[PDB]
PDB file of C-alpha atoms in Angstrom:
ATOM      1  CA  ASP A   1     118.474  95.023 122.183  1.00 43.43           C
ATOM      2  CA  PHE A   2     122.234  95.620 121.119  1.00 39.26           C
ATOM      3  CA  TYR A   3     124.444  95.963 118.179  1.00 35.93           C
ATOM      4  CA  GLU A   4     127.339  98.270 116.730  1.00 35.15           C
ATOM      5  CA  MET A   5     126.715  99.792 113.565  1.00 32.64           C
ATOM      6  CA  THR A   6     129.124  99.386 111.057  1.00 32.52           C
ATOM      7  CA  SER A   7     130.834 100.547 107.505  1.00 29.90           C
ATOM      8  CA  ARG A   8     129.705  97.069 106.465  1.00 32.34           C
ATOM      9  CA  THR A   9     126.129  96.841 106.190  1.00 32.47           C
ATOM     10  CA  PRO A  10     123.226  97.335 104.312  1.00 29.49           C
ATOM     11  CA  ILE A  11     120.657 100.242 104.071  1.00 28.38           C
ATOM     12  CA  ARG A  12     117.350  99.205 104.717  1.00 30.01           C
ATOM     13  CA  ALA A  13     117.943  97.808 108.047  1.00 28.82           C
ATOM     14  CA  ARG A  14     118.791 100.242 109.794  1.00 30.34           C
ATOM     15  CA  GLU A  15     116.303 102.384 109.586  1.00 28.42           C
ATOM     16  CA  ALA A  16     113.925 100.079 111.304  1.00 30.73           C
ATOM     17  CA  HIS A  17     116.899  99.478 114.059  1.00 28.87           C
ATOM     18  CA  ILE A  18     117.154 103.287 114.724  1.00 28.52           C
ATOM     19  CA  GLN A  19     113.276 104.024 114.567  1.00 28.59           C
ATOM     20  CA  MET A  20     112.578 101.307 116.441  1.00 30.19           C
ATOM     21  CA  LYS A  21     115.421 101.903 119.146  1.00 29.94           C
ATOM     22  CA  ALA A  22     113.912 105.655 119.587  1.00 30.44           C
ATOM     23  CA  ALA A  23     110.521 104.702 119.320  1.00 28.23           C
ATOM     24  CA  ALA A  24     111.028 101.941 121.744  1.00 31.96           C
ATOM     25  CA  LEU A  25     111.908 104.123 124.192  1.00 30.91           C
ATOM     26  CA  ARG A  26     109.477 106.714 125.462  1.00 28.38           C
ATOM     27  CA  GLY A  27     108.478 108.801 128.593  1.00 31.60           C
ATOM     28  CA  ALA A  28     111.727 107.656 131.153  1.00 31.93           C
ATOM     29  CA  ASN A  29     113.680 110.524 131.803  1.00 28.22           C
ATOM     30  CA  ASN A  30     117.386 111.577 132.387  1.00 26.24           C
ATOM     31  CA  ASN A  31     115.555 112.847 135.890  1.00 27.73           C
ATOM     32  CA  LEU A  32     119.388 112.693 137.177  1.00 27.21           C
ATOM     33  CA  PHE A  33     118.735 113.316 141.034  1.00 27.37           C
ATOM     34  CA  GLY A  34     116.718 110.942 143.665  1.00 25.62           C
ATOM     35  CA  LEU A  35     116.527 112.708 147.333  1.00 24.37           C
ATOM     36  CA  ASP A  36     119.316 113.649 149.772  1.00 21.46           C
ATOM     37  CA  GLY A  37     120.038 112.226 153.125  1.00 18.87           C
ATOM     38  CA  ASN A  38     120.488 115.172 155.606  1.00 16.88           C
ATOM     39  CA  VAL A  39     116.675 115.112 156.842  1.00 17.40           C
ATOM     40  CA  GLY A  40     115.976 117.073 159.724  1.00 16.11           C
ATOM     41  CA  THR A  41     112.771 118.294 159.585  1.00 13.39           C
ATOM     42  CA  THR A  42     114.048 120.783 162.540  1.00 15.64           C
ATOM     43  CA  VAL A  43     117.004 121.841 164.331  1.00 14.40           C
ATOM     44  CA  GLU A  44     118.315 120.907 167.932  1.00 14.52           C
ATOM     45  CA  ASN A  45     116.962 122.459 170.883  1.00 14.43           C
ATOM     46  CA  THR A  46     120.109 123.187 173.026  1.00 16.66           C
ATOM     47  CA  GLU A  47     118.627 123.601 175.901  1.00 17.46           C
ATOM     48  CA  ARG A  48     117.945 122.001 179.694  1.00 16.60           C
ATOM     49  CA  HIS A  49     114.676 120.779 181.531  1.00 16.09           C
ATOM     50  CA  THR A  50     115.023 121.110 185.381  1.00 13.08           C
ATOM     51  CA  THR A  51     112.097 121.187 187.902  1.00 11.24           C
TER      52      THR A  51
ATOM     53  CA  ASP B   1      98.269  76.703  57.485  1.00 13.40           C
ATOM     54  CA  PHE B   2     102.202  75.827  56.806  1.00 15.97           C
ATOM     55  CA  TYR B   3     104.273  75.100  54.271  1.00 15.77           C
ATOM     56  CA  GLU B   4     108.074  75.641  52.657  1.00 14.60           C
ATOM     57  CA  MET B   5     108.331  76.946  49.490  1.00 12.70           C
ATOM     58  CA  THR B   6     110.822  75.353  47.546  1.00  8.38           C
ATOM     59  CA  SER B   7     112.566  75.359  43.824  1.00  8.15           C
ATOM     60  CA  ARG B   8     110.618  72.799  42.032  1.00  7.88           C
ATOM     61  CA  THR B   9     106.832  74.282  42.362  1.00  4.39           C
ATOM     62  CA  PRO B  10     104.436  76.371  40.361  1.00  4.19           C
ATOM     63  CA  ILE B  11     103.682  80.041  39.697  1.00  5.12           C
ATOM     64  CA  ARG B  12     100.026  80.212  39.777  1.00  5.09           C
ATOM     65  CA  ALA B  13      99.559  78.692  43.407  1.00  6.12           C
ATOM     66  CA  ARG B  14     102.017  80.770  45.388  1.00  2.00           C
ATOM     67  CA  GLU B  15     100.208  84.253  44.480  1.00  2.06           C
ATOM     68  CA  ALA B  16      97.076  82.278  46.389  1.00  2.13           C
ATOM     69  CA  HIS B  17      99.691  81.091  48.823  1.00  2.00           C
ATOM     70  CA  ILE B  18     100.960  84.876  49.599  1.00  2.00           C
ATOM     71  CA  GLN B  19      97.950  86.826  48.951  1.00  2.00           C
ATOM     72  CA  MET B  20      95.774  84.652  51.157  1.00  2.00           C
ATOM     73  CA  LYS B  21      98.470  84.036  53.594  1.00  2.00           C
ATOM     74  CA  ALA B  22      99.115  88.026  54.471  1.00  2.00           C
ATOM     75  CA  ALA B  23      95.492  88.827  54.238  1.00  2.00           C
ATOM     76  CA  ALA B  24      94.167  85.987  56.688  1.00  2.00           C
ATOM     77  CA  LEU B  25      96.323  88.174  59.036  1.00  2.00           C
ATOM     78  CA  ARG B  26      95.135  91.500  60.316  1.00  2.00           C
ATOM     79  CA  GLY B  27      95.081  93.743  63.131  1.00  2.00           C
ATOM     80  CA  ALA B  28      97.303  91.133  65.563  1.00  2.00           C
ATOM     81  CA  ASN B  29     100.321  93.352  66.770  1.00  2.00           C
ATOM     82  CA  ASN B  30     103.780  93.027  67.361  1.00  2.00           C
ATOM     83  CA  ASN B  31     102.817  94.478  70.527  1.00  2.00           C
ATOM     84  CA  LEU B  32     105.523  93.499  72.874  1.00  3.77           C
ATOM     85  CA  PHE B  33     104.981  93.778  76.251  1.00  3.92           C
ATOM     86  CA  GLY B  34     102.389  93.044  78.672  1.00  2.00           C
ATOM     87  CA  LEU B  35     102.989  94.546  81.762  1.00  2.00           C
ATOM     88  CA  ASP B  36     105.196  94.411  84.990  1.00  2.00           C
ATOM     89  CA  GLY B  37     105.129  92.866  88.346  1.00  2.00           C
ATOM     90  CA  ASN B  38     106.651  95.746  90.590  1.00  2.00           C
ATOM     91  CA  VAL B  39     103.353  97.450  91.319  1.00  2.00           C
ATOM     92  CA  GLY B  40     103.686  99.370  94.643  1.00  2.00           C
ATOM     93  CA  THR B  41     100.986 101.822  94.235  1.00  2.00           C
ATOM     94  CA  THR B  42     102.631 104.011  97.468  1.00  3.90           C
ATOM     95  CA  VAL B  43     105.770 103.619  99.267  1.00  6.41           C
ATOM     96  CA  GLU B  44     106.712 101.684 102.488  1.00  7.53           C
ATOM     97  CA  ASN B  45     105.717 104.870 105.548  1.00 11.86           C
ATOM     98  CA  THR B  46     108.785 103.771 107.782  1.00 11.90           C
ATOM     99  CA  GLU B  47     107.458 105.035 110.882  1.00  9.63           C
ATOM    100  CA  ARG B  48     105.421 104.013 114.227  1.00 11.93           C
ATOM    101  CA  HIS B  49     102.004 104.163 115.824  1.00 11.44           C
ATOM    102  CA  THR B  50     102.329 105.136 119.219  1.00 10.32           C
ATOM    103  CA  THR B  51      99.766 106.103 122.053  1.00  6.25           C
TER     104      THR B  51
END
């Protein structure tokens, strides 16, 4: 799942490493944000009930 | 089929030995090489299938 490429390494296997890396990814997005907390579907009324 | 000429031997029979030697050969050639092993009619693709 993980490795660090270095300058002592062969040519061939690099191809499979990178191809199978990126192609093994798909669909999942950077898709930064979720949703926010301040969720008041309405505003306070600021009034009074009386008879 | 085989013999080694030597310096104790007659004159006459040598003629038949050598003529019938070489003329009994024909057609077959030095024809060094056969064919090589590395037989890839194509190159590896080095890709991926996905949906």
